């Protein structure tokens, strides 16, 4: 009953994202169920003061499920070759109601991400990767 699917998202000019601590970047909705819609939320300058030095990344259930939803997820960044880097997964499955989010306050250190030597912002583009495995009922 496990449905697996992935979503990728390239944010242009990421270093120019004027968002401050608490401000949000929202992905588009994605799915494949075709009715169960999800979205990604990014805090470029951290969610709170504890995660001020980090970027936060969350998976959000948008639609209203007709049954109970439990999902595993994995976030990663794609380098210029499309390879997954800096992966971080939930390990366990989490219950999702409409509007519920799960993710990582400290997904990646802002200094590691913004350092050109690490090559995770090619052409100032941040490409985020999310893989979800979900079971309804």
């Amino acid at each position: 009953k496990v449905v697996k699917f992935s979503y990728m998202w390239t944010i242009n000019n990421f270093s120019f994202c004027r968002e401050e601590m608490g401000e949000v970047i929202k992905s588009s909705t994605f799915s494949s169920n075709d009715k169960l819609k999800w979205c990604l939320r990014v805090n470029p300058k951290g969610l709170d003061e504890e995660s001020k030095d980090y970027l936060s990344l969350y998976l959000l259930l948008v639609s209203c499920p007709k049954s109970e939803v439990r999902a595993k997820f994995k976030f990663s960044i794609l380098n210029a070759k499309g390879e997954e880097t800096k992966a971080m997964e939930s390990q366990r499955a989490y219950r999702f109601v409409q509007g519920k989010d799960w993710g990582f306050k400290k997904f990646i250190r802002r200094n590691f991400l913004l350092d050109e030597a690490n090559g995770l912002l090619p052409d100032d583009k941040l490409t985020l990767f999310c893989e979800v495995s979900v079971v309804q009922d």
Partner: peptide
């Protein structure tokens, strides 16, 4: 572990 911003 993963965290949430919701109860």
């Amino acid at each position: 572990k993963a965290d949430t911003t919701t109860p």
